[PDB]
Design a protein around this nucleic acid. Structure first.
Ligand SMILES: [Mg+2]
Ligand SMILES: [Mg+2]
Ligand SMILES: [Mg+2]
Ligand SMILES: [Mg+2]
Ligand SMILES: [Mg+2]
Ligand SMILES: [Mg+2]
Ligand SMILES: [Mg+2]
Ligand SMILES: [Mg+2]
Ligand SMILES: [Mg+2]
Ligand SMILES: [Mg+2]
Ligand SMILES: [Mg+2]
Ligand SMILES: [Mg+2]
Ligand SMILES: [Mg+2]
Ligand SMILES: [Mg+2]
Ligand SMILES: [Mg+2]
Ligand SMILES: [Mg+2]
Ligand SMILES: [Mg+2]
Ligand SMILES: [Mg+2]
Ligand SMILES: [Mg+2]
Ligand SMILES: [Mg+2]
Lengths: 70, 145, 143, 141, 67, 60, 80, 206, 63, 55
RNA sequence: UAAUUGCGAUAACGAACGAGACCUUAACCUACUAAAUAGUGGUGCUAGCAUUUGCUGGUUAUCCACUUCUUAGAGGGACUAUCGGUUUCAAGCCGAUGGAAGUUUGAGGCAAUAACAGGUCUGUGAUGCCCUUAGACGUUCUGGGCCGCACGCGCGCUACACUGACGGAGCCAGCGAGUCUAACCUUGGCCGAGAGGUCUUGGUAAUCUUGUGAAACUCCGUCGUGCUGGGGAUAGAGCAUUGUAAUUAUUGCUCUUCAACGAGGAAUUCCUAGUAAGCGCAAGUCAUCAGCUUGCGUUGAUUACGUCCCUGCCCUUUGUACACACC
């Protein structure tokens, strides 16, 4: 209920410009930045991988992990 | 799956079946706050209605929603089995029903009363506030009323 | 070099075989799919909705390949899981003989398995053929 | 008849039988390659022998194993024991002693009981508790 | 506590008493001795015995032992 | 091994001591090819109170 | 015809517990002093060349409250 | 590294870092040193391991429990609170994940970070309920290095587990997080607080 | 803060009515030739290293 | 009969729940005698002749 | 020392019961005897993939050979061995090396003299005496009851979730048990969403069920901290199974209904290594019913290796007017 279950355009744009300086990104980490609940947060983790920013260094279920692109 | 977008198209919360339903929840489960629709029933119905379950209650075209209600209150027509239903073989007209929403309350009454009104021990026992399904009543259930 | 299915890890294979039976169109998928539950020791139907009958068949196929002969009864016991009897201690429970026996007929009528002597079902000669094929396809994405 | 040996590995009830003949360096378990095995987190547990003692070593031999009994972990420790015990069996009858005794040394130093079977085992439970040591509950009065 | 009972120490005493030449600082032959030279009904007891008539023997060679 | 696991007590009082008798059944089979004479000879004799002897025939 | 019985005296009754229980029973049933009875039994078992022997008599004899005696002689072990 | 292959093949980075160095999931055991005297001996590191799983008879003798590789002593102590008794595989994976996390942040051998957080939460001294007559005071005591390691491993995981309870962040993160703030103590961590507040009361009664 | 390192040079026994505590004589490594006896909390063998958080003060009996 | 049962007030849960629970409920073991175990109540007694005849 | 287990001291010397020995089970034998009711390699017969030999399977006997694994006979093995610390340099204890194994090797079985108004006359066609004996307290037949519900106590089961629930997918045990004058264990084929049904079938069993493909667990997804998809009480309606009989609901299945419980006050239980705890299985019971028990294996820790503070008990010493022995 307490917000983060959709996409509000400003949110999408927020997600592109707010993920540098993130030495760590994951499911938890994304919810932590006052946005996206674990579900649509998980989708971001695939679609930030669409191209750029996130490097897949850890595998699977529960635990995700990425770092800023190089 | 896919990063989606939409405009102002989705409205949060949406009333149907004389009750209220939260949008920002995956629609399958959203519908379960209606009395008489467990997860299973919800599942089969939306599958029947040709609706994407990856969606929330939030999206879901008004037409999609209309179709969803339709099947619910007529399950035998839209090819849902019979053993899937909360009231097979009535006890008067013998039809098979899926009693929904504000009505399942009505029917719990009808039956309970039918028992009492018939003086059946089950009923007597219901009226006394005790457990009926033949459990030991010595140690368990103390808080209760 | 040459290849088996034993040369491929479980998941990559069965998903590759699921993808294949799906891509195909030839199958025989009962009809009570999506409305059925796969075992009494379960709570909700499968989440793959459209599909998973492939997932199982492919799972079925590989298993009967791995050995001499298995029946419907064996797959039930295989595929089953834990049933919470709510407040009462879990016990193992068998799964549905329908899902399997229909998968067995579906893979048989498609000629990937045959009614073996001794009993049950045994991997068809042409099953070998097509299994070891897509198995080799699975390592070809890894090349 | 080419040069070959047979060995085993036991952890708990698991017993892992290995046939080490001479060939082109295969290492398959039950029927699949050693690069599968999964458990996976414990994959390196059974890679372990080959890495401890130089990947080469295996080029003149074929290796197979087939575990029965035990459990999803009991078997992982079993099969590795059989692998390394076999590698040392083979150098005992065929290669020379000092190569064999140089292999025992690399395994024993590191070790996780690769040559030597773990003695541990379930203790019988006795009446009055769900466990062996575990006793039920009492209340006095 | 691996404290050897009397019968083990009792018998060791007697064996050293009357068969000192024959015997050694070696259990393994002390063992084989006990077979030929003594009647015992169990393997364990013979070993448990021989091991001690050994030890007793091993510290006679450097000082006497009372008894 | 045939276990039988019982409370020692005829009744119910006392800490719940349990006790398990057991009976050990040992079975051998020895395959022989002989004519009729030796069979009957070797079977009537070799008798033993406590050993149960069973002589069959055939290949089916 | 398929079943056949033979009687057979036994080499020394004096070393069969069960032979000697049934003796006492018959000693006391035939009205004999209690000590006399057992002390005879023990003294015959011994003479039959046993290493040792023990006779317990539990129950109630002429008085109201129960008692129990032990009559042993020679050598017995009790464990293992 | 002179690549070698036979019949059933052994993977590149597998062939690679294996025969060369003898390192962790894939992390360095060399370097990695215990910046506090003592605690060495009572912190393993070398001999090196592949993963933290080991049928190690570490309990049949008093002190030999010390010879267990510290990383695995850290996992071992994750698999508790009843529901997770046993379940080593559960833990092992968390630890893999954890070290990856720790490494992401601030570099450093995560296995070396683990060293630091342990070294940095062991109470140099504590107290114990001596009698002294009914109304018991609290005698200060300098506590063992072994206890200091143990108490550290317990303290670390626990306050992580507790924080990890009832929220989105996973065990592996809170674990990492607890370690990261403890590798160089920051008093924003569960352990450093308790460490310091154990030495607080220890000091306060001598 | 003055940190003081001392090496256990003998194990003397357990005190504390409970008995979780052990009496031990140590030798500090930063200038040896002087000894003080301290009271442990955890298990201790010979040749261990205690962090004497305050260098000079010792106990004896514990109840 | 059953008609009696349902109609009869002074019955069912609602009623009992509104009643105060007797204190004999939360009692003790009651015990009664044990301290007298070794003191024979028969009041009779054996007699040193009769035991000597028997034993 | 676990031990009246020993050393030692010594008006005692030297012995026996009990402890130990002993026995049983779990550990070790590329040594011995063997096995189509156990399994391995070779060979044919043969399938799939590669082809350059190869790789992975089928084939209760198409043949040859073997005993590593399995089985159980007979042996062997360990004696706290070697070495060193410690100690009246005594019995011992501690550490290192070796070792299948070095905590009584782990775990059990057996277990002296004595005590109790412990429990059991409701296990006994064991039994004294008392009671009853035909309108019976004998016995049997019909039906109810032991389950009855304001509440107090105890053993348990399931939970309060994200080391998780769910849905796919991986796929791994050991101790057992099974039908003759009978209907036990059940593979396989169909039918059914399920529970189940129906046709056959192997097994009196290392031969068949059964590799008991058990569960935690492992993997890829869904949900995302919200009494939520945690939790599943209570209840409605339907279907089946056991049984002569299921109502006060034997059990099993499906739909719906969706409680309390957000880690639990004072208190208090159990436990030291394959142990604790998590996890399922077989056997007992059993027509039908395990939230019980007896065993079993699977995953597998944290913390002591100490003390006399609490509690319990043993031992001295000491008092006794008790000895039916402080009831
Ligand atoms: Mg509903
Ligand atoms: Mg499953
Ligand atoms: Mg399963
Ligand atoms: Mg004796
Ligand atoms: Mg004994
Ligand atoms: Mg559970
Ligand atoms: Mg053999
Ligand atoms: Mg060693
Ligand atoms: Mg009494
Ligand atoms: Mg009786
Ligand atoms: Mg009752
Ligand atoms: Mg009890
Ligand atoms: Mg699951
Ligand atoms: Mg139907
Ligand atoms: Mg038949
Ligand atoms: Mg809920
Ligand atoms: Mg649930
Ligand atoms: Mg049963
Ligand atoms: Mg019972
Ligand atoms: Mg006196």
């Amino acid at each position: 209920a307490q917000h983060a279950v959709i996409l509000d355009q400003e949110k999408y744009d927020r997600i592109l410009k707010e993920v540098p300086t993130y030495r760590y990104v994951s499911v938890s980490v994304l919810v932590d930045r006052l946005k996206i609940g674990g579900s649509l947060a998980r989708i971001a983790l695939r679609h930030l991988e669409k191209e750029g920013i996130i490097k897949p260094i850890s595998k699977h279920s529960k635990q995700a992990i990425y770092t800023r692109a190089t | 799956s896919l990063v989606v977008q939409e405009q102002g198209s989705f409205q949060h919360i949406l009333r149907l079946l004389n009750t209220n339903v939260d949008g920002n929840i995956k629609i399958v489960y959203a519908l379960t706050t209606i009395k008489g629709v467990g997860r299973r029933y919800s599942n089969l119905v939306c599958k029947k209605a040709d609706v994407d379950l990856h969606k929330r209650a939030g999206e879901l075209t008004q037409e999609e929603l209309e179709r969803i209600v339709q099947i619910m209150q007529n399950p035998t027509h839209y090819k849902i089995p019979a053993w899937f239903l909360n009231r097979q073989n009535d006890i008067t007209d013998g039809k098979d029903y899926h009693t929904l929403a504000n009505n399942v309350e009505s029917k719990l009454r009808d039956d309970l009363e039918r028992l009492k009104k018939i003086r059946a021990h089950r009923g007597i026992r219901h009226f006394w506030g005790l457990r009926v399904r033949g459990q030991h009543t010595k140690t368990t259930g103390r808080r209760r009323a | 070099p040459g290849v088996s299915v034993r040369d491929v890890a479980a998941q990559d294979f069965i998903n590759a075989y699921a993808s294949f039976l799906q891509r195909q169109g030839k199958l025989e998928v009962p009809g009570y799919v999506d409305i059925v539950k796969t075992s009494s020791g379960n709570e909700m139907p499968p989440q793959d909705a459209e599909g998973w009958f492939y997932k199982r068949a492919a799972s079925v196929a590989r298993h009967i390949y791995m050995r001499k002969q298995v029946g419907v009864g064996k797959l039930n016991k295989l595929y089953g899981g834990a049933k919470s009897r709510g407040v009462r201690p879990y016990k193992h429970i068998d799964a549905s003989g329908s899902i399997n026996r229909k998968v067995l007929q579906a893979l048989e009528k498609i000629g990937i398995v045959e009614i073996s002597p001794k009993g049950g079902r045994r991997i068809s000669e042409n099953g070998q053929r097509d299994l070891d094929r897509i198995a080799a396809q699975t390592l070809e994405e890894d090349e | 008849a080419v040069p070959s040996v047979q060995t085993f590995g036991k952890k708990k009830s698991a017993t892992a039988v290995a046939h080490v003949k001479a060939g082109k360096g295969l290492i398959k378990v039950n029927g699949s390659p050693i690069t599968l095995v999964e458990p996976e987190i414990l994959r390196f547990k059974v890679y372990e022998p080959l890495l401890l003692v130089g990947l080469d070593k295996f080029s003149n031999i074929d290796i197979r194993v087939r575990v029965t009994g035990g459990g999803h972990v009991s078997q992982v420790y079993a099969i590795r024991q059989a692998i390394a015990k076999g590698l040392v069996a083979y150098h005992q009858k065929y290669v020379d002693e000092q190569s064999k005794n140089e292999l025992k040394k690399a395994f024993t130093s590191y070790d996780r009981t690769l040559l030597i079977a773990d003695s541990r085992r379930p203790e019988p439970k006795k009446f009055g508790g769900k466990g062996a040591r575990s006793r039920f509950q009492k209340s006095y009065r | 506590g691996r404290v050897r009972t009397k019968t083990v120490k009792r018998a060791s005493k007697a064996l050293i008493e009357r068969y000192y030449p024959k015997l050694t600082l070696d259990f393994q032959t002390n063992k084989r001795l006990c077979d030929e030279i003594a009647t015992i009904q169990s393997k364990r007891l013979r070993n448990k015995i021989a091991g001690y008539t050994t030890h007793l023997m091993k510290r006679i060679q450097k000082g006497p032992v009372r008894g | 091994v045939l276990k039988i696991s019982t409370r020692k007590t005829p009744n119910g009082e006392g800490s719940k001591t349990w006790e398990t008798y057991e009976m050990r059944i040992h079975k051998r089979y020895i395959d022989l090819e002989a004519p009729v004479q030796i069979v009957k000879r070797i079977t009537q004799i070799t008798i033993e109170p406590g050993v149960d002897v069973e002589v069959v025939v055939a290949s089916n | 015809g398929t079943i056949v019985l033979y009687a057979e005296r036994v080499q020394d009754r004096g070393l069969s517990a069960v032979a000697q229980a049934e003796s006492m029973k018959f000693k006391l049933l035939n009205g004999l002093a209690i000590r006399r009875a057992a002390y005879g039994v023990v003294r015959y078992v011994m003479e039959s060349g046993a290493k040792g022997c023990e006779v317990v008599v539990s129950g109630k004899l002429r008085a109201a409250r129960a008692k129990a005696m032990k009559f042993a002689d020679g050598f017995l072990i009790h464990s293992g | 590294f002179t690549p070698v292959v036979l019949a059933t093949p052994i993977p590149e980075e597998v062939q690679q870092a294996q025969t060369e160095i003898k390192l962790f999931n894939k992390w360095s055991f060399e370097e990695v040193e215990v910046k506090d005297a003592s605690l060495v001996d009572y912190v393993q590191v070398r001999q090196p391991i592949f993963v933290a799983h080991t049928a190690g008879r570490y309990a049949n003798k008093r002190f030999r429990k010390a010879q267990c590789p510290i990383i695995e002593r850290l996992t071992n102590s994750l698999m508790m609170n009843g529901r997770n008794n046993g379940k080593k595989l559960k833990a092992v994976r968390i630890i893999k994940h954890t070290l990856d996390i720790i490494n992401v942040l601030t570099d450093q051998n995560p296995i070396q970070v683990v060293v630091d957080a342990i070294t940095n939460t062991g109470p140099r001294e504590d107290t114990t309920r001596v009698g002294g007559g009914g109304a018991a005071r609290r005698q200060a005591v300098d506590v063992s290095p072994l206890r200091r390691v143990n108490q550290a491993i317990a303290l670390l995981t626990i306050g992580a587990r507790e924080a990890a309870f009832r929220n989105i962040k996973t065990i592996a993160e809170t674990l990492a997080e607890e370690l990261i703030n403890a590798a160089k103590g920051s008093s924003t961590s569960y352990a450093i607080k308790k460490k310091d507040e154990l030495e607080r009361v220890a000091k306060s009664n001598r | 803060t003055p940190v003081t390192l001392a090496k256990v040079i003998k194990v003397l026994g357990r005190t504390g009515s409970r008995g979780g505590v052990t009496q031990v004589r140590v030798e500090f490594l930063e200038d040896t030739s002087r000894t003080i006896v301290r009271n442990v909390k955890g298990p201790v063998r010979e040749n261990d290293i205690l962090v004497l958080m305050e260098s000079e003060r010792e106990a004896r009996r514990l109840r | 009969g059953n008609e009696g049962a349902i109609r009869d007030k002074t019955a069912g849960r609602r009623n009992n729940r509104s009643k105060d629970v007797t204190d004999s409920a939360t009692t003790k073991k009651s015990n009664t005698r044990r301290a007298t175990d070794r003191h024979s109540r028969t009041g009779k007694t054996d007699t040193k002749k009769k035991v000597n005849q028997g034993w």
